Amino acid sequence: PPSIGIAVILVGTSDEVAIKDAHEKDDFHHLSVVPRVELVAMNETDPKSIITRICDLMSDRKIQGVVFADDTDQEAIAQILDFISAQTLTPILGIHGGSSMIMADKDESSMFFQFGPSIEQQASVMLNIMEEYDWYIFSIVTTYFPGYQDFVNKIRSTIENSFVGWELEEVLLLDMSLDDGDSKIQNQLKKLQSPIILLYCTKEEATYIFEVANSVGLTGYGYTWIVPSLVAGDTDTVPSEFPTGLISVSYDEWDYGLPARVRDGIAIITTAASDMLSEHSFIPEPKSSCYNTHEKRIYQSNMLNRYLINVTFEGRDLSFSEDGYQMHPKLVIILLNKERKWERVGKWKDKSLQMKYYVWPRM
Amino acid sequence: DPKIVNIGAVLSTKKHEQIFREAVNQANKRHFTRKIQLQATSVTHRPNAIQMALSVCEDLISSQVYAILVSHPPAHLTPTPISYTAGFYRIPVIGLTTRMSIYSDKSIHLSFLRTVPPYSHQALVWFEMMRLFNWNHVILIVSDDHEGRAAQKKLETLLEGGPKADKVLQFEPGTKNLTALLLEAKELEARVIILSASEDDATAVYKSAAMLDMTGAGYVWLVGEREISGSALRYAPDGIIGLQLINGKNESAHISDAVAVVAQAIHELFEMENITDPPRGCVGNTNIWKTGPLFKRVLMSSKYPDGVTGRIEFNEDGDRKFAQYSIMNLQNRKLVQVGIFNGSYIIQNDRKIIWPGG
Numbered sequence A: 001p002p003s004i005g006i007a008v009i010l011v012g013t014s015d016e017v018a019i020k021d022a023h024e025k026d027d028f029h030h031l032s033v034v035p036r037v038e039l040v041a042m043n044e045t046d047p048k049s050i051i052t053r054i055c056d057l058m059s060d061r062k063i064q065g066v067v068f069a070d071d072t073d074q075e076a077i078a079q080i081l082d083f084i085s086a087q088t089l090t091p092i093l094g095i096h097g098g099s100s101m102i103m104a105d106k107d108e109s110s111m112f113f114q115f116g117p118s119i120e121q122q123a124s125v126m127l128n129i130m131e132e133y134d135w136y137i138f139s140i141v142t143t144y145f146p147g148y149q150d151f152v153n154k155i156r157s158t159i160e161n162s163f164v165g166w167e168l169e170e171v172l173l174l175d176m177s178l179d180d181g182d183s184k185i186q187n188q189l190k191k192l193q194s195p196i197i198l199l200y201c202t203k204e205e206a207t208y209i210f211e212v213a214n215s216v217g218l219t220g221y222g223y224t225w226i227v228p229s230l231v232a233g234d235t236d237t238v239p240s241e242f243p244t245g246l247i248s249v250s251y252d253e254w255d256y257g258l259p260a261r262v263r264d265g266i267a268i269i270t271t272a273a274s275d276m277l278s279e280h281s282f283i284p285e286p287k288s289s290c291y292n293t294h295e296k297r298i299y300q301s302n303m304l305n306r307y308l309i310n311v312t313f314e315g316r317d318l319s320f321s322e323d324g325y326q327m328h329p330k331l332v333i334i335l336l337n338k339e340r341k342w343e344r345v346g347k348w349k350d351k352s353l354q355m356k357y358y359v360w361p362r363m
Numbered sequence B: 001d002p003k004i005v006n007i008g009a010v011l012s013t014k015k016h017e018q019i020f021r022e023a024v025n026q027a028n029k030r031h032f033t034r035k036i037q038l039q040a041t042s043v044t045h046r047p048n049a050i051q052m053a054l055s056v057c058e059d060l061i062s063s064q065v066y067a068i069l070v071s072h073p074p075a076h077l078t079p080t081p082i083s084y085t086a087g088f089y090r091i092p093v094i095g096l097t098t099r100m101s102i103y104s105d106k107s108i109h110l111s112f113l114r115t116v117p118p119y120s121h122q123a124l125v126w127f128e129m130m131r132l133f134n135w136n137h138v139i140l141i142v143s144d145d146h147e148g149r150a151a152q153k154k155l156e157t158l159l160e161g162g163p164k165a166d167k168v169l170q171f172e173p174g175t176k177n178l179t180a181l182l183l184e185a186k187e188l189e190a191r192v193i194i195l196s197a198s199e200d201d202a203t204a205v206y207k208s209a210a211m212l213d214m215t216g217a218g219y220v221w222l223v224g225e226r227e228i229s230g231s232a233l234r235y236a237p238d239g240i241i242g243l244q245l246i247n248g249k250n251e252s253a254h255i256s257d258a259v260a261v262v263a264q265a266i267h268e269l270f271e272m273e274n275i276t277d278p279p280r281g282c283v284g285n286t287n288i289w290k291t292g293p294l295f296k297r298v299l300m301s302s303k304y305p306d307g308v309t310g311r312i313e314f315n316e317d318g319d320r321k322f323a324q325y326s327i328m329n330l331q332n333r334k335l336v337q338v339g340i341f342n343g344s345y346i347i348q349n350d351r352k353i354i355w356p357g358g
């Protein structure tokens, strides 16, 4: 059976060896097609480095798809990858790190898919947490970071359609594309009364918002902040300005390890190509270059997407949403404790929340 | 020896690169430049988006540009890859000629100003016309894409807080038979119709509207610039009123004005303390320019009153204010200027308007 090229790109220190070894289910494909996996290491995660690296791969080898993992908190990596995916019409999976941080409004012709929960799923997990502990009165803070509308709308849609006594008191929109020399964001935050605050922003943005919130007394007891996965990010990196008592929904390899993810990424791309080949007696030819995409555009399509989103493998449903997220991720609820460590305090599985505590101990 | 501060440009031709150079040179002559002194760094558009992104890194950001002017090329290649890459570092981008409303979206383009207004701002002119000619009941037809909905949002903001929109109809972009939609409009008592649509979609509207005899006497048609351009002109009904942004396509004028504004803003920036340099090159650099957001605020609130294109200011979305439009009227199948919107005021000229019918 013919071989398709899959680049696995690893940014930052990695057990390459544990990774190769988990893919020894390579004797693991009984499909119309078999993977030819090439580990590439990358040191840098700026736009140029990421683009040139993938383009060089694509021109020195026939790449049917890319599996991408990094060890950064850089959500912009997801955006760069979507861009690259759409321009070259190459499947890219962001399975870990910045690459897996929510990218809202992917390009129409993107073939970029992320391990991790959608924005709207996280939003609903947050409300489930709040419902558990009868925290019905809350406000929202977001930046202009893409997704923030989907976040706010999802909350609003949920609570307006429910007979629970939700009270959404205030919704702040913080513009962090301008400097804060007029103390604008301070004056906005000062407006917050609610005991629960939902925050949607990036990790670096939260770092600043928390600093300001502290200055006006909003991070202590009486105030509980809840953030999504991308704010917590890498849980071994905890900014000093993050307040103890911070709650997050999280996906950062707790039970789902990188090796297992790379194995699943390879499988998804390989199953998808096999499925298309079996039905249409071709697959899309790997792009010879990025630098000729304007010419070759009528000759290319995102056909392979409909298969990429509907893979089951070794018994497990690895479906994506068409919005480009994992369908049924096992999520971990985590809490930043007195020792500034992130701590498991709940699981979200089978659209069901299982929390550790009935009453929150002091931290 | 002064500190050299680079301005970037991505422009359509080498002629325009030379214009950029000479504009920056004039800015240096005009200003006091013992402390800071501008340097032009420029490039023309690459043939695809990836090449363009790379070139921004290799050619511009490697020179530590404080800002990047960007023209819309004539003859599929948008500012977007430049906005994305510059936005990565919070280096302000100044659009010279791009009118699409999507670039007013801060989530997507979070350091983007432009010296021309978005198409949606044509609603400002429509509104003043509706007061002037006392059209208090209008039907609004828009394409169900971003641009169409942007125009609707903008008009409804102006109306819903006088004249009222008696209904709004949206249609799917690329629909050819629009008879269903237009019969719905024919039903209503309002006979002033406002249209936002692309060239080809306006064509479809015009044709269908003719079959239904809605282009004759009693009806008023009020549109923007796209809807009386190219093929849209070909089938436009006579008496139609539309708009042309004055200097909207003059890349040389806007280079000149943008450089003046940016030069002014740079010198204002360096009155303040703790100005950091932008990153030198893309490779290895993943942090934002710390001073980027400050420079954006300074640009946003810049005023240049004596610009070639008129009075330069920017609104909350970094879009051009006080833009000037030609008010155009199709008379015996010639586009004839019947007035201008001078930035805040409608000025009718001595050429008489002829309405649909008369």
Ligand SMILES: *[C@@H]1O[C@H](CO)[C@@H](O[C@@H]2O[C@H](CO)[C@@H](O[C@@H]3O[C@H](CO[C@H]4O[C@H](CO)[C@@H](O)[C@H](O)[C@@H]4O)[C@@H](O)[C@H](O[C@H]4O[C@H](CO)[C@@H](O)[C@H](O)[C@@H]4O)[C@@H]3O)[C@H](O)[C@H]2NC(C)=O)[C@H](O)[C@H]1NC(C)=O
Pocket: B310, B311, B342, B343, B344, B345
């Ligand atoms: C687009 O077009 C508009 C309208 O023509 C322009 O706005 C006008 O700009 C002119 C300047 O040329 C202004 O004229 C000045 O008006 C002053 C009084 O204004 C009051 O009264 C008027 C009329 O009722 C109101 O519209 C206005 O709101 C005020 O309540 C006068 O005091 C000025 O006279 C002074 O200067 C002249 C020099 O010409 C001297 O001779 C006088 O002694 C005196 O010192 C002057 O006449 C006018 O006010 C503006 N109108 C409005 C509504 O703002 C825009 O400038 C134009 N835009 C562009 C880009 O061209």
Ligand SMILES: CC(C)CN(CCc1ccc(Cl)c(Cl)c1)C[C@H](O)COc1ccc(NS(C)(=O)=O)cc1
Pocket: A047, A076, A079, A080, A083, A104, A105, A143, A144, A145, A146, A174, A175, A176, A177, A178, B053, B084, B085, B086, B087, B088, B106, B107, B108, B109, B110
């Ligand atoms: C979401 C898509 C459609 C647009 N993004 C693309 C980003 C991108 C894409 C490709 C490249 Cl090659 C690069 Cl380099 C960067 C733009 C980018 O994602 C903007 O990121 C933001 C926007 C707002 C905010 N919040 S704010 C305005 O308060 O400061 C933070 C980050």
Ligand SMILES: *[C@@H]1O[C@H](CO)[C@@H](O)[C@H](O)[C@H]1NC(C)=O
Pocket: A041, A042, A043
């Ligand atoms: C990354 O850095 C390591 C050691 O610093 C080096 O061995 C490797 O060649 C580098 N990779 C690239 C792509 O430059």
Ligand SMILES: *[C@@H]1O[C@H](CO)[C@@H](O)[C@H](O)[C@H]1NC(C)=O
Pocket: A310, A311, A312
């Ligand atoms: C594709 O999705 C369909 C649902 O219509 C379902 O049969 C299955 O999950 C997928 N088919 C496969 C994996 O062969």
Ligand SMILES: *[C@@H]1O[C@H](CO)[C@@H](O)[C@H](O)[C@H]1NC(C)=O
Pocket: B250, B252, B253, B254, B256, B308
């Ligand atoms: C464009 O503007 C310039 C001024 O920068 C002017 O010299 C030229 O005449 C204008 N071109 C047109 C066609 O109006």
Ligand SMILES: [Cl-]
Pocket: A041, A042, A043, A044, A049, A053
């Ligand atoms: Cl590298």
Ligand SMILES: [Cl-]
Pocket: A082, A083, A084, A086, A087, A107
């Ligand atoms: Cl894209």
Ligand SMILES: [Cl-]
Pocket: A100, A101, A102, A116, A228, A229, A230, A231
């Ligand atoms: Cl996330």
Ligand SMILES: [Cl-]
Pocket: A048, B057, B058, B062, B281, B282, B283
């Ligand atoms: Cl570089």
Ligand SMILES: [Cl-]
Pocket: B338, B339, B348, B349, B350, B351, B352, B353
């Ligand atoms: Cl007139």
Ligand code: NA
Pocket: B103, B104, B105, B106, B109, B111, B112, B113, B317, B318, B319
């Ligand atoms: Na803007």
